[PDB]
């Protein structure tokens, strides 16, 4: 449909922003940033365009969906009938208890990855992916493994593999670690997204395209100007330790959502009353955020008929967090739809919202990353807003790639 | 009966004096001023239907602010807090852990933002500073009182949270006392559904703030006295929400314990009577029979305090609620042992308040996180603050019987 | 009758023999100590299960604690309301039993309950007497005796505050006795949790008091005392750093502690049950390549622990079922093993088990003798004495065996006198 030219416009804009906000445009390693963009667009051309790639994506998703099903066996064991099919016969659409359907999945996956770390399975994958990035982008060992580890584990405990390297890494390396942690999504939280209604194959592609895309806008904003350098008892224990850690994470998540949803509703109450003085008492923050990020939604490849809707979802993902944005996005994926969003639009939003690139994850990074290296606490906080932008643009980049290779009319139910 | 009421107030204060730490340190300007505000606001809403609409709407306006907190709860638990609960389970459909405790997360996150944008900072400097001239209180002491009139006991120490760390013995006991006697929100609508007159409920709602200060500035006045950070606003709301999360856990767990403990305490007494002729002998009746003479002092002259006394005993032990549930069984024209209006007005005020034994759990468990180095000083005054909270509620009963005849 | 009681002795012998073979110094085994422990263990079993006067005391204790649990439910019904009511069975039916709201809250109350009695002094009194009896009949030291006695009520070696002044300088035979006593026993908080699931209360009461002499039994069998036990006059440990101030504070202190335990337990169960279901999914697919796609981890652990189950007095027609239960209790934990065991107790059961079998399983599965409790020992016991952390980690697997053998020993004794009705 000759939309391949329109998609090239989206990619050009996002890269341009990073170059304009660079600390040293003359030190931008072209071999690194053009390679990162080449790899990121290659993965999008693989699991979305070619037939063989979509199989590997659907295959990997059929496996994970089974894993989630196994995790549901533990959920049905803990809360019993409160997560059964009878809940829909008693409370209708309210039978879906978010605290008992989504949050418990964070606990299971946190303990599952704890087991994979113990065995060495996770260490193996990070080494391979990380080793590939440093060999194709020319990045250092630390920031390559960091982006590779961020594909799976959490944003807090900012990937433990880089523990000794953080203390003496450059500003470009440290920023690459922070960017990778924001441009990507924790594997533990991902299973929660699936239970909400977010398309699984899109979440898989976005997680792997977060590593090269994370290093992309990290080297664009802050290019390397200096020189780089270079336990549980048993498996049962490791499985139990990850469960406890995952428990306090879900609690922190469920509490943050109960507050944010309430506070946003409170803000809309203010604008709903104040706006009534100008004749717009139905004006909400959702709208305002949509009207603001409306042009940006047009750039990535979303039609203007649905650009105002995608504006709020991308906006909330930045000014608040990902869970709130996704909660108001799965509503458009329902069969009985108030808005019939196109397949090429729902695909872009699913990739643009996938990431920890929000204002709330700044102190989250500063807090956890400073534990490993307190001497760099002043550098992390200073690159706080910069890391969010680097992470946000990375997710926006994957969104444009998504919209380009969904031009093959690849529907997502 | 005006002399009988003055007799009631004297005795209600005399008990506080006998249980006070330092009598010579008692500020005469503060305490006498507190009693003046309690009797003033009482007649302001009882006699004149102008303040009943002003203060009445004030409570509804502030409650609608907290009501936004339900939008986040309905999103989290979904249908476990819908109306379908009352159609299936009925009265048991009200889940305390899902309708009350999650609200603590909102307050801990809401005021995490207000302190960040300096709104609560102003409300302590202005409202607290104003009552700092009215009485020599630390204004971190007074703001908690003004807040408690609109927020619950689980949501009252959260208001002056960052002041509890470097807080003295007096201000600590005063904030807690305010929490004990304070009524707000979800229960404010509950009592109305019971049939007990709304104008009476508003009168006691605004009598908990000066009444809480009335006894807390008696049992322990001020001595040696009165004198990491979030990055973004979103972060503050996040940090606050996670902080409130563990608070609700600490409070709910303590409540689950104390309630079961009191119920276990009720057993032993039962068995000892179980040896012996008297006994079903619940702690409710025992503390209730001790309130019977004290009831006559307030009002309810005789052949009435024998029952009304046992209703107050239930107030200290198990609940406010149980006492009301039985009081509503006396207002019913099945017409046994019917009582006067000046009688029911006293009992309604004497029963209004959440200063029960179980409520201490909210304090100890709640302040275990806001100020963990202070919880040891909390339980030491736990029972003492129930006493200060119960006498505060009884003080309104005396003003009730006086200004209803 | 006379052939089933001769079986039991054989089983006991087999259990003891394993400990002797796995001994570091068989020649140093104090016969007066180990034979006394086995005598005491088998005496308590013969008392509360065989004689009429003993069963009345066990029943009276059961009726007493049952009332405590009933009082604990008053706090549970208060917090969750109708979600733990009778209407749950009229709606969700069998799914009306929410484990996270029926069992886990009980851990909170009992933790706060035992916290109160530690304040009063009732706990120190019971531990001192039982501990004093174990040191005057077995010849064990003061420390390990109090530890084994304290592990009857509180457990998981989180509250042997009595031996905190002793651990730093005690011998390995003493240290192992502490580790064994923790795994061989349970906790008051988790015992109440087992009751709500459906586990027979009188069996849990008998097993808890049998865990003290049984814990010291295989502890002195595996590693006898070869050095000198430190006497009282030397102990010089110092600070209290006390949480209690009054009974009100202690009641809330144990409540919050019981909460984070109930949360950790509930989280670890959600993981373990799911992970096993995931393994069963793997074996379910891989096993189909050999013609057995219905093969599960429950099955394997059944045939693997089938010989061990048989010895302790369980009929072969029921040995396969008791295999998976004992197995899971060791390789996973006690809650999971009990979760699949209470299904055989309900009248709607698929397979009916005999009275002499359900008693054996109930006693065998009672204890923290599992592979996941090792780190909790090393983790919690090292805070009191970090210089002994390297020694505790090594005796980790040995302690689990000691703890498991203790639970297996109490199982044989149970099936002996429950068979002799």
Coordinates of C-alpha atoms in Angstrom, one line a residue, chain B residues 80 85 88-89 92-98 101 249-250 252-261 263-264 267 319 360 364 375-376 379-380 383, chain C residues 68 71-72 74-76 78-83 85 87-88 91-92 105 108-109 112-113 116 242 245-246 248-249 251-253 255-256 259 263:
Chain B
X80 CA -15.3 -8.8 45.5
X85 CA -21.7 -9.4 47.8
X88 CA -25.1 -13.5 48.2
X89 CA -23.5 -13.3 51.7
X92 CA -21.0 -10.7 55.9
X93 CA -20.5 -9.4 52.4
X94 CA -18.7 -6.4 53.9
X95 CA -15.1 -7.5 53.7
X96 CA -13.0 -5.4 56.1
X97 CA -9.7 -6.3 54.5
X98 CA -10.8 -5.2 51.0
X101 CA -7.4 -1.6 54.6
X249 CA -0.6 -5.5 56.2
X250 CA 0.8 -4.5 59.6
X252 CA -4.7 -6.0 59.4
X253 CA -2.4 -8.6 61.0
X254 CA -2.5 -7.0 64.4
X255 CA -6.3 -6.6 64.2
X256 CA -6.6 -10.3 63.2
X257 CA -4.5 -11.0 66.3
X258 CA -6.0 -8.7 68.9
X259 CA -9.6 -9.6 67.9
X260 CA -8.8 -13.3 68.2
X261 CA -6.9 -12.6 71.5
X263 CA -12.1 -13.4 72.0
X264 CA -9.7 -15.9 73.6
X267 CA -13.1 -17.6 76.9
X319 CA -16.9 -2.7 69.0
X360 CA -5.0 -0.3 69.6
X364 CA 0.7 -0.1 67.3
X375 CA 6.1 1.7 68.8
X376 CA 7.5 0.7 72.2
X379 CA 1.8 0.2 73.5
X380 CA 2.9 1.6 76.9
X383 CA -4.6 1.0 77.2
Chain C
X68 CA -8.1 -21.6 70.6
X71 CA -11.1 -18.1 68.9
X72 CA -8.5 -17.5 66.2
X74 CA -13.1 -14.9 65.2
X75 CA -10.3 -12.7 64.0
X76 CA -10.4 -14.3 60.6
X78 CA -13.6 -10.3 61.2
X79 CA -11.0 -9.5 58.6
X80 CA -12.3 -11.3 55.5
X81 CA -15.9 -11.5 56.4
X82 CA -18.1 -13.6 54.2
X83 CA -15.2 -14.9 52.1
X85 CA -18.2 -18.0 55.7
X87 CA -22.1 -19.3 52.0
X88 CA -18.8 -20.0 50.1
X91 CA -21.7 -21.0 45.8
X92 CA -18.3 -22.2 44.7
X105 CA -4.4 -16.2 58.7
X108 CA -0.6 -14.8 62.0
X109 CA -2.7 -15.4 65.2
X112 CA 1.2 -13.5 68.0
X113 CA -0.2 -15.9 70.6
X116 CA 2.4 -13.2 74.3
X242 CA 14.3 -6.5 73.3
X245 CA 7.8 -3.6 76.3
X246 CA 4.4 -4.9 77.5
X248 CA 0.2 -5.2 74.2
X249 CA 3.4 -4.7 72.1
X251 CA 0.8 -9.3 70.8
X252 CA 1.3 -7.0 67.8
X253 CA 4.9 -7.8 67.3
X255 CA 1.2 -10.5 64.6
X256 CA 3.3 -8.6 62.0
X259 CA 2.0 -11.9 58.6
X263 CA 3.0 -14.2 53.1

